[PDB]
C-alpha cells in the first residue's frame, strides 16, 4: 500500500505590511498555525537575501544515514566534502536512483519511495546529511554585520531584517546561533520537539525542496503514546531526549492511530515555522541548503 500524503499545512503569503517582523506575524497567524503544528511562510517576491556563506572554505563531514536501520533490527562518516563535491555526489545519487534528471523527479515519488525504503528489509539505501553545522564555523547563509565577511549596500537590508535568522530573539526569561543543514535526496530527520518546547524557524536558502510533517501540540501526548506502543521494546523505556534520536515513523501509522499530521514541500526562499511542542520530521528532495534556529516568545 503506497504512502498516502497527509493534508497540506497552511501557507501564508504576507503582504509587505504584514511582513514587517516575524514575531508579530507569527502571533497573528497563531490561532490557525498552532492547530497544524507547522506552517509555511512565503516572503514577498522581491525579498531575496544573497547567500553569504564562505563557499570556498566550506568543508564538512556529513553523518551517514541508513533509511531502514530500525526495521533491520559498517559505513562511517569519514568522507569530507566541500559544498560543491557534496552537491555533485547528491545530484549523481538522485539521478542514478530515479534514472532521470534530478529536477524531473516528482516530489510525490521521492516521498513515496522514501517511506517505502524506510520500511524495506530487502533494499538497504544509505545516504549522507550535513546536519548540525554551526553557523559560527563557516558563517550564516544570511549576511551578518560581523566583520568576517563584507556586506554590500544591497545586502545591508538583509543583514538587518527581522527575518534574518541571526536576528531572532533566542533568550528566555529566567530568574544560541543558527544551525545549517546541507541535504541530499532521502536525508532525513526523525520525529522530535525542541528543547524547552521552543518554536523553531527554518529557511531554505537554495536547492531542491525540503518535505515536512508536523503534528499540532494538542496531539503531542497522543503521538508519544503511539510511539511508545510501536517502538522496539529496547527503546521503549528510553528518556525522550534519547528516544527522539530513533523516533522514525511513517506518518500514515500516526494517522491510522488518530494523530493529526500535516505536510508541506518547503521550496527555496520559503520559511517553515514549528510551534511550541509541535512534533515534526522530514526529508530532503535533493541537494539543498537550510538554516534554522530556535526562538521563544
Ligand atoms: N533525527 C535527526 C537526524 C538528523 C538531524 C536531526 C536534528 O539535527 C540535530 C543537529 N543539531 C543537534 C542539536 C540541536 C540542533 C540540531 C534535526 C532537527 C531538525 N529540525 C527541523 C528541521 C531539520 C532539518 O534537517 O531541516 C532538522 S535536523 C535529527
Ligand atoms: Mn526541529
UniProtKB/Swiss-Prot annotation:
Residues 9-50 form the JmjN domain. Signal peptide: none annotated. It is found in: Nucleus, Nucleolus; Nucleus. Fe cation binds at residues 192, 194, 280. Histone demethylase that specifically demethylates 'Lys-4' of histone H3, thereby playing a central role in histone code. Does not demethylate histone H3 'Lys-9', H3 'Lys-27', H3 'Lys-36', H3 'Lys-79' or H4 'Lys-20'. Demethylates trimethylated and dimethylated but not monomethylated H3 'Lys-4'. Regulates specific gene transcription through DNA-binding on 5'-CCGCCC-3' motif. May stimulate transcription mediated by nuclear receptors. Involved in transcriptional regulation of Hox proteins during cell differentiation. May participate in transcriptional repression of cytokines such as CXCL12. Belongs to the JARID1 histone demethylase family. Interacts with SUZ12; the interaction is direct. Interacts with the viral protein-binding domain of RB1. Interacts with ESR1, MYC, MYCN and LMO2. Interacts with HDAC1; this interaction impairs histone deacetylation by HDAC1. Interacts with BMAL1 and CLOCK. Interacts (via PHD-type 1 zinc finger) with histone H3 unmodified at 'Lys-4' and (via PHD-type 3 zinc finger) with histone H3 di- and trimethylated at 'Lys-4'. It is linked to A chromosomal aberration involving KDM5A has been found in M5 type acute myeloid leukemia. Translocation t(11;12)(p15;p13) with NUP98. Chromosomal aberrations involving KDM5A have been found in M7 type childhood acute myeloid leukemia. Translocation t(11;12)(p15;p13) with NUP98. The GSGFP motif is required for the interaction with SUZ12. The ARID domain specifically binds to the CCGCCC motif and is required for the lysine-specific histone demethylase activity. The PHD-type 3 zinc finger is required for the interaction with histone H3 di- and trimethylated at 'Lys-4'. This is Lysine-specific demethylase 5A. It comes from Homo sapiens (Human). The chain holds residues 11 to 588 of 1690 of the full protein.
Amino acid at each position: 500500500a503506497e504512502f498516502v500524503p497527509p493534508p497540506e499545512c497552511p501557507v501564508f503569503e504576507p503582504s509587505w505590511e504584514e511582513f514587517t517582523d516575524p514575531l508579530s506575524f507569527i502571533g497573528r497567524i497563531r490561532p490557525l498555525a498552532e492547530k497544524t503544528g507547522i506552517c509555511k511562510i512565503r516572503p514577498p517576491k522581491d525579498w531575496q537575501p544573497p547567500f553569504a556563506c564562505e563557499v570556498k572554505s566550506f568543508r564538512f563531514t556529513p553523518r551517514v544515514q541508513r533509511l531502514n536501520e530500525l526495521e533491520a533490527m559498517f559505513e562511517q562518516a569519514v568522507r569530507e566534502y566541500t559544498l560543491q563535491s557534496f552537491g555533485e555526489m547528491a545530484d549523481n545519487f538522485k539521478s542514478d536512483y530515479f534514472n532521470m534528471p534530478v529536477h524531473m523527479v516528482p516530489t510525490e515519488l521521492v516521498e513515496k519511495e522514501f517511506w517505502r525504503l524506510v520500511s524495506s528489509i530487502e533494499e538497504d539505501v544509505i545516504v549522507e546529511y550535513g546536519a548540525d553545522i554551526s553557523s559560527k564555523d563557516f558563517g550564516s547563509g544570511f549576511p551578518v554585520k560581523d566583520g568576517r565577511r563584507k556586506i554590500l549596500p544591497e545586502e545591508e537590508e538583509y543583514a538587518l531584517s527581522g527575518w534574518n535568522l541571526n536576528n531572532m530573539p533566542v533568550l528566555e526569561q529566567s530568574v544560541k546561533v543558527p544551525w545549517l543543514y546541507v541535504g541530499m535526496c532521502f536525508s532525513s530527520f526523525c520525529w522530535h520537539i525542541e528543547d524547552h518546547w521552543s518554536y523553531s524557524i527554518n529557511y531554505l536558502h537554495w536547492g531542491e525542496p525540503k518535505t515536512w510533517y508536523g503534528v499540532p501540540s494538542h496531539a503531542a501526548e497522543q503521538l508519544e503514546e503511539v510511539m511508545r506502543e510501536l517502538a522496539p521494546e529496547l527503546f521503549e523505556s528510553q528518556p525522550d531526549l534519547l528516544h527522539q534520536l530513533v523516533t522514525i515513523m511513517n506518518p500514515n501509522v500516526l494517522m491510522e492511530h488518530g494523530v493529526p499530521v500535516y505536510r508541506t514541500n518547503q521550496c527555496a526562499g520559503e520559511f517553515v515555522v514549528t510551534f511550541p511542542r509541535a512534533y515534526h520530521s522530514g526529508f530532503n528532495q535533493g541537494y539543498n541548503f537550510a538554516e534554522a534556529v530556535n526562538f521563544c516568545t
